[PDB]
Amino acid sequence: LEKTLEWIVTNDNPDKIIDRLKNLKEQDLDQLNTLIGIANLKKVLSVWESNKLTNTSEKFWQSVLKENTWILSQIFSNPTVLINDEAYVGGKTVKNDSGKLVDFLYANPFSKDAVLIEIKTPSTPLITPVYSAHKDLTGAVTQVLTYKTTLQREYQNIDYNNYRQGIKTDFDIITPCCVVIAGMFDTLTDTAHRHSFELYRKELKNVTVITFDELFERVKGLIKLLEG
Amino acid sequence: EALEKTLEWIVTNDNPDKIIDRLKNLKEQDLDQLNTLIGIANLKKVLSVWESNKLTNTSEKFWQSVLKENTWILSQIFSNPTVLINDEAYVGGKTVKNDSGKLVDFLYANPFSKDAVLIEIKTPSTPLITPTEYRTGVYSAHKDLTGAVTQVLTYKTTLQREYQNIDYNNYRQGIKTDFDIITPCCVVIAGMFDTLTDTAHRHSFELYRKELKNVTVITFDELFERVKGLIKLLE
Amino acid sequence: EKLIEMFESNTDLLTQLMEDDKSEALEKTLEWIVTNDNPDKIIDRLKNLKEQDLDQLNTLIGIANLKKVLSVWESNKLTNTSEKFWQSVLKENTWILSQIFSNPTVLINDEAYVGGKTVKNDSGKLVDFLYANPFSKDAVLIEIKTPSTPLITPTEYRTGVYSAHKDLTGAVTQVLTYKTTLQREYQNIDYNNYRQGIKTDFDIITPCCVVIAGMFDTLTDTAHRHSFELYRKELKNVTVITFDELFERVKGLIKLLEG
Amino acid sequence: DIEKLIEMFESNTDLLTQLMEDDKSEALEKTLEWIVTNDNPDKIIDRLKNLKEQDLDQLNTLIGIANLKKVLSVWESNKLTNTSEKFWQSVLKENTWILSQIFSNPTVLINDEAYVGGKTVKNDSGKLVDFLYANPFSKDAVLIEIKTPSTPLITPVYSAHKDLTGAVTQVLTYKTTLQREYQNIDYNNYRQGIKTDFDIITPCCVVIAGMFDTLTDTAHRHSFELYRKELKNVTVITFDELFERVKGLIKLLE
Numbered sequence: 001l002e003k004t005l006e007w008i009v010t011n012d013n014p015d016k017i018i019d020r021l022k023n024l025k026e027q028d029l030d031q032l033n034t035l036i037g038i039a040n041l042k043k044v045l046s047v048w049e050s051n052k053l054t055n056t057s058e059k060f061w062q063s064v065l066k067e068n069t070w071i072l073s074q075i076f077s078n079p080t081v082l083i084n085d086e087a088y089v090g091g092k093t094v095k096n097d098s099g100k101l102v103d104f105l106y107a108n109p110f111s112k113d114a115v116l117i118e119i120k121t122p123s124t125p126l127i128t129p130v131y132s133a134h135k136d137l138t139g140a141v142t143q144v145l146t147y148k149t150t151l152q153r154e155y156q157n158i159d160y161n162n163y164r165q166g167i168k169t170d171f172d173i174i175t176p177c178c179v180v181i182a183g184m185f186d187t188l189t190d191t192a193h194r195h196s197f198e199l200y201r202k203e204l205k206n207v208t209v210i211t212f213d214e215l216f217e218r219v220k221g222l223i224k225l226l227e228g
Numbered sequence: 229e230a231l232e233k234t235l236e237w238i239v240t241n242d243n244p245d246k247i248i249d250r251l252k253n254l255k256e257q258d259l260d261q262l263n264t265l266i267g268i269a270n271l272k273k274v275l276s277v278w279e280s281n282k283l284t285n286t287s288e289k290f291w292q293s294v295l296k297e298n299t300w301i302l303s304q305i306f307s308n309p310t311v312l313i314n315d316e317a318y319v320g321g322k323t324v325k326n327d328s329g330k331l332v333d334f335l336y337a338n339p340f341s342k343d344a345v346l347i348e349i350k351t352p353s354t355p356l357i358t359p360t361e362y363r364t365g366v367y368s369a370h371k372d373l374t375g376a377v378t379q380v381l382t383y384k385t386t387l388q389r390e391y392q393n394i395d396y397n398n399y400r401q402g403i404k405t406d407f408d409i410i411t412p413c414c415v416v417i418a419g420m421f422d423t424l425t426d427t428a429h430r431h432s433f434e435l436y437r438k439e440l441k442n443v444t445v446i447t448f449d450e451l452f453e454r455v456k457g458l459i460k461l462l463e
Numbered sequence: 464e465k466l467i468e469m470f471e472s473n474t475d476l477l478t479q480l481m482e483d484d485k486s487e488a489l490e491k492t493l494e495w496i497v498t499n500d501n502p503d504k505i506i507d508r509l510k511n512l513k514e515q516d517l518d519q520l521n522t523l524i525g526i527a528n529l530k531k532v533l534s535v536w537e538s539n540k541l542t543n544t545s546e547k548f549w550q551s552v553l554k555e556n557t558w559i560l561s562q563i564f565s566n567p568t569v570l571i572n573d574e575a576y577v578g579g580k581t582v583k584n585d586s587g588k589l590v591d592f593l594y595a596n597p598f599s600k601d602a603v604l605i606e607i608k609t610p611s612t613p614l615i616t617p618t619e620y621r622t623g624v625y626s627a628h629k630d631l632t633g634a635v636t637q638v639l640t641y642k643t644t645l646q647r648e649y650q651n652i653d654y655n656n657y658r659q660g661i662k663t664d665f666d667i668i669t670p671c672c673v674v675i676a677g678m679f680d681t682l683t684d685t686a687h688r689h690s691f692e693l694y695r696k697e698l699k700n701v702t703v704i705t706f707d708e709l710f711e712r713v714k715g716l717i718k719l720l721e722g
Numbered sequence: 723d724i725e726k727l728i729e730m731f732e733s734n735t736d737l738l739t740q741l742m743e744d745d746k747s748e749a750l751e752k753t754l755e756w757i758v759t760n761d762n763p764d765k766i767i768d769r770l771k772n773l774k775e776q777d778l779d780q781l782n783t784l785i786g787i788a789n790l791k792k793v794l795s796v797w798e799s800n801k802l803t804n805t806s807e808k809f810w811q812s813v814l815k816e817n818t819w820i821l822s823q824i825f826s827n828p829t830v831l832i833n834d835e836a837y838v839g840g841k842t843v844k845n846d847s848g849k850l851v852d853f854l855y856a857n858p859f860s861k862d863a864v865l866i867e868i869k870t871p872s873t874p875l876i877t878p879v880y881s882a883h884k885d886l887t888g889a890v891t892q893v894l895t896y897k898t899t900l901q902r903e904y905q906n907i908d909y910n911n912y913r914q915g916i917k918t919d920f921d922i923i924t925p926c927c928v929v930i931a932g933m934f935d936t937l938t939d940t941a942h943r944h945s946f947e948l949y950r951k952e953l954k955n956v957t958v959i960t961f962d963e964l965f966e967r968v969k970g971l972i973k974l975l976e
Contacts, residue, residue: 527773
């Protein structure tokens with residue numbers, strides 16, 4: 001098995017391999033894709049388990065989550081993911097010719113909406129000693145809302161410029177979703193902190209705040225669903 | 229022999245756990261390249277089938293079977309691991325077999341999430357708008373599309389009511405329950421978009437399509453445009 | 464002058480003059496109130512009355528208007544099947560429509576009705592009037608059909624599933640087209656104003672759309688009602704209402720005012 | 723006497739016109755009092771129906787404008803002295819049709835009571851949800867919380883005051899309770915076999931706060947605007963903005 005997998009990856013003509021693969025039944029290709037996805041999920045879970053208690057750098061976690069965007073698409077139910085002014089579709093980076101993400105979004109064939117994700121460290125505090133939310137959370141929420149507003153305004157301008165050329169007279173409106181990945185939920189030992197945090201999350205208008213623990217519980221749930 | 233038979237052995241193994249463990253221990257680049265190759269092959273096969281049979285075959289069952297054989301691609305396109313087609317459940321390639329025989333029982337104990345995708349599949353020759361105009365420059369949608377939308381909504385309502393019955397039974401039993409209503413997503417695959425040649429037809433169709441609250445309407449042209457885009461991205 | 468001198472010396476004269484049906488003093492007085500050229504003085508006089516008298520007068524007038532509309536519907540609900548007739552009937556009573564749908568501005572057949580009077584905008588453009596509205600920049604778009612308009616297709620798409628009739632869908636599409644045209648012209652006005660250095664926030668106005676359709680009594684079996692309710696509850700911005708529900712609201716308002 | 727008066731009035735319409743026009747003779751007020759205080763209102767209602775529909779609409783418009791002006795005068799008189807919450811609650815309850823016009827909903831919920839068309843909708847059972855489920859006038863309703871104009875708005879950047887947050891929480895709790903009871907009633911109706919569709923109610927929440935003039939510096943205004951913009955389901959309106967809307971409606975209808 002190992003030698004066959006080594007030979008598949010390292011070969012002269014990938015096109016010949018693809019042509020030989022196309023002769024298989026679709027039910028075999030689906031199960032192969034499912035097994036590869038399960039392997040990727042287990043690898044990500046092991047990586048999180050190894051570095052849970054040590055790494056506190058935002059860059060490491062941002063890179064880890066950017067390497068696995070399809071898991072985020074499955075979790076948040078949208079094939080388009082926007083991280084730091086870049087669009088990921090099907091695990092690949094969409095490279096627009098011009099330096100304008102809105103140009104790609106307006107002509108996007110895959111979906112009409114996207115998901116805006118802001119990624120922090122698991123060490124970010126959540127509550128301050130009812131109780132008030134920490135600054136590191138509200139700053140991220142405000143930043144994501146500002147980015148969403150800018151995207152919507154530019155999309156409206158592009159649509160109006162399209163209208164005046166006679167191409168169309170109908171309205172195209174974009175409403176992205178905002179997600180903020182906060183730190184860890186287990187630190188809220190006392191009931192007061194949990195109650196305040198739950199109320200704060202319930203009061204948010206257009207932003208969904210999720211911790212790392214809940215995210216990887218979701219990862220475990222997806223592993224159990226696919227594997228079962 | 230060295231390629232096809234080995235993969236057939238991989239698929240037909242009693243204990244997939246060993247295979248998954250062996251795959252996990254591989255290097256990241258090898259696994260990524262293998263995933264890319266398999267995805268490209270599957271997408272290309274589906275696109276070849278579409279290109280071969282997009283002008284002649286006009287049977288609902290043919291297209292329903294064709295799309296049911298590729299549930300992984302549908303789940304990737306619509307971003308949901310659970311797909312429901314004609315009272316059946318597919319989780320990433322395989323059919324869900326229920327010993328109890330009830331789909332709501334399976335949906336109730338779902339570990340990932342309780343929301344799924346309801347897909348209604350028609351032929352690519354389904355009319356989109358009524359030929360005769362209602363008034364000058366105004367066209368009404370064809371009755372086939374409205375009937376399909378109503379069918380999907382009826383099925384969703386039945387699912388929600390059965391889930392509510394299960395929840396109330398559990399509450400009466402004694403287990404603490406929350407009475408929130410589940411909201412699955414509804415998709416209808418209509419015919420061809422290129423048959424709308426003049427501005428009025430496209431305007432009326434877009435006005436009808438953008439007014440729906442919970443239902444999505446897709447043509448075969450746009451679906452396989454997405455397939456072509458994925459193929460182009462993976463290369 | 465001499466008439467006022469006589470009236471200062473007697474109250475029974477005025478009381479009997481109002482009581483006598485042949486004199487018709489009451490109707491002439493009300494017509495003089497309606498057609499006077501100085502509404503400001505009349506409004507100032509009305510404001511100085513007691514609250515009880517003003518409320519009683521308002522109740523009586525509202526009851527009379529609602530009863531007149533209900534009598535018209537009861538007379539013509541089974542015979543007349545002309546769309547123009549019902550459009551005119553509902554245009555005669557725009558105040559009741561504003562009270563029912565809670566919006567002082569009503570748009571029917573590309574015309575604006577405020578205070579039961581047609582807005583005689585000097586400019587040919589209605590969006591110019593909507594742009595300078597001092598209360599709000601929204602309005603209600605109303606599409607009026609006959610009470611004999613079919614609601615669902617007579618045949619069934621499948622076992623127990625019925626699709627909507629093309630007349631209703633055509634009406635909804637017409638209302639949406641009109642709303643889109645209004646929004647685009649408003650955007651044009653906003654951009655033209657911004658081009659001249661006037662700070663304008665580029666917000667899109669969202670008026671409300673109402674479609675009046677046939678009768679709910681024709682949906683006898685449960686399948687028809689189920690299909691119609693499934694169709695009607697999926698529209699995002701358009702409200703579909705039948706004549707039966709509208710005049711049930713009218714009857715409810717009459718019952719509330721009388722009680 | 724009476725017959726001579728009738729004949730003289732019939733001979734000259736100008737006499738009847740001038741009798742009403744002249745300010746010295748209070749013919750108009752006497753006529754209105756005779757209309758209001760008549761023993762038999764049914765005959766008056768039958769007589770009024772004879773007049774055209776446009777005349778009735780214009781009379782209703784005039785009476786509405788008079789009511790709006792009276793309410794505006796009441797606001798102008800007591801906006802600085804009176805500070806009783808019950809006073810303002812009664813003032814706003816007596817004029818619910820203005821609120822319905824402003825917030826675009828025919829049903830108004832104030833202090834666990836329903837107002838439709840300016841009249842209190844009396845329900846047989848002591849259950850508002852029973853009326854709301856069988857309400858023939860609209861689908862949803864509006865929940866209104868009425869504070870005083872002296873209510874503080876900001877905490878001495880800045881943050882929202884305690885009273886405003888408490889009012890918002892109270893309104894949200896009431897809305898949640900109403901939604902839960904409505905859903906339970908709908909499920910019981912489904913289980914009886916009457917229907918199978920879903921009936922979902924989504925009430926709107928409005929809080930009437932104090933005055934906007936107190937926010938002098940730019941920081942306070944910016945903080946308050948941000949707080950209002952970030953609210954999820956509640957709309958906060960001050961008395962000054964409410965009566966500016968009243969002035970706008972008066973200008974529009976006239």
